[PDB]
Amino acid sequence: SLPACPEESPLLVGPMLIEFNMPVDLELVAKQNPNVKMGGRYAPRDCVSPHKVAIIIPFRNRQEHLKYWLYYLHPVLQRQQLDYGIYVINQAGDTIFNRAKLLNVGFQEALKDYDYTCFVFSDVDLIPMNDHNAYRCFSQPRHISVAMDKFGFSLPYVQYFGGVSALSKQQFLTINGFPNNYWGWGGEDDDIFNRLVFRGMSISRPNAVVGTTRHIRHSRDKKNEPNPQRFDRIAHTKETMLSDGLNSLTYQVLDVQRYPLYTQITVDIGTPS
Numbered sequence: 001s002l003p004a005c006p007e008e009s010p011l012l013v014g015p016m017l018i019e020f021n022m023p024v025d026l027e028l029v030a031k032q033n034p035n036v037k038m039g040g041r042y043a044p045r046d047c048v049s050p051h052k053v054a055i056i057i058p059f060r061n062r063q064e065h066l067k068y069w070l071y072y073l074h075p076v077l078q079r080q081q082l083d084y085g086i087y088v089i090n091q092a093g094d095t096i097f098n099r100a101k102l103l104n105v106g107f108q109e110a111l112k113d114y115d116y117t118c119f120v121f122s123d124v125d126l127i128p129m130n131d132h133n134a135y136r137c138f139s140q141p142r143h144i145s146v147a148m149d150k151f152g153f154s155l156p157y158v159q160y161f162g163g164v165s166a167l168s169k170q171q172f173l174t175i176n177g178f179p180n181n182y183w184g185w186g187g188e189d190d191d192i193f194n195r196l197v198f199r200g201m202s203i204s205r206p207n208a209v210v211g212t213t214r215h216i217r218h219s220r221d222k223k224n225e226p227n228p229q230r231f232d233r234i235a236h237t238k239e240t241m242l243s244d245g246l247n248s249l250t251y252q253v254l255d256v257q258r259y260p261l262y263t264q265i266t267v268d269i270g271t272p273s
């Protein structure tokens with residue numbers, strides 16, 4: 001009996017002040033966000049959103065960044081009127097980071113909770129400066145973080161698909177998900193771009209002003225060295241995507257924590273094979 005939410009949310013306020021020098025307290029954030037339910041889940045109570053969104057954050061040893069993430073995004077995601085949930089996919093162990101494989105785990109585990117039809121993939125240190133930048137899916141793959149301060153407020157190159165993107169369930173299935181074998185920093189986002197193109201898709205983007213985004217300045221994490229094989233790997237995506245992705249994924253979930261502002265899935269994703 002509830003009516004559809006308006007196509008564009010009327011709650012948005014546009015540009016926002018984003019700051020990272022104060023301390024953050026999640027208990028207080030939870031208090032400020034009383035409609036967010038256990039596990040970081042929220043749907044509007046006045047209308048039915050067509051946007052059923054799981055937001056998936058690749059994670060390890062970035063608790064501080066996450067606190068800022070949750071403090072900023074949660075009010076924004078509720079103003080966007082999304083039926084959404086937050087998933088921090090936390091890599092067990094202390095071997096080489098695998099961002100793309102975590103994202104695949106997130107897609108697959110979130111679908112177990114709820115009929116999501118849209119997946120936002122977001123680095124933990126990226127905060128949107130304009131709530132008009134929609135954190136939901138379009139009829140093409142959607143690059144969200146298009147004007148990052150760290151790149152001078154534009155794309156570093158026109159095929160850049162990193163940072164924060166969104167893919168419908170179908171788009172993500174259509175490319176066999178992300179590659180599993182990009183270990184250490186770099187390239188997996190380019191591979192994902194290649195995949196979308198090889199499947200007849202193109203990148204949808206908001207304008208540069210609306211897609212203005214802040215990156216929390218930070219230094220190198222240990223265990224995520226530039227993958228020296230990345231240039232070779234993005235050159236062969238068309239062949240490798242056929243059998244590297246969802247259809248070749250395994251992993252072992254060690255732990256599932258329902259915090260008030262997010263679900264954290266701690267997962268053993270192994271080492272390079």
Ligand SMILES: CC(=O)N[C@H]1[C@H](OC[C@H]2O[C@@H](O[C@H]3[C@H](O)[C@@H](O)[C@H](O)O[C@@H]3CO)[C@H](O)[C@@H](O[C@@H]3O[C@H](CO)[C@@H](O)[C@H](O[C@@H]4O[C@H](CO)[C@H](O)[C@H](O)[C@H]4O)[C@H]3NC(C)=O)[C@H]2O)O[C@H](CO)[C@@H](O)[C@@H]1O
Binds near residue numbers: 156185188231
């Ligand atoms: C596929 C990929 O890497 N994709 C990522 C994309 O990469 C763009 C380049 O990033 C440079 O590092 C930047 C970084 O992007 C930025 O975030 C940060 O702020 O500044 C960094 C440093 O300026 C990176 O250095 C570069 O790597 C070099 O690429 C060249 C040409 O493509 C390649 O030939 C180099 O390899 C070396 O070549 C030299 C130079 O002649 C010597 O022969 C060396 O011996 C040889 O290794 C690469 N250099 C190095 C040091 O590896 C690109 O990776 O960027 C986006 C956004 O950052 C990512 O999200 C993409 O995944």
Ligand SMILES: NCCCCCCOP(=O)(O)OP(=O)(O)OC[C@H]1O[C@@H](n2ccc(=O)[nH]c2=O)[C@H](O)[C@@H]1O
Binds near residue numbers: 059
């Ligand atoms: N000028 C100083 C340069 C320091 C460069 C380090 C690379 O920085 P970025 O290019 O932002 O990538 P990144 O933030 O390290 O990795 C991307 C994302 O992967 C995640 N990630 C990466 C490594 C890690 O140990 N933990 C983690 O959670 C996190 O979501 C992060 O936002």
Ligand SMILES: [Mn+2]
Binds near residue numbers: 123125215218
């Ligand atoms: Mn970063």
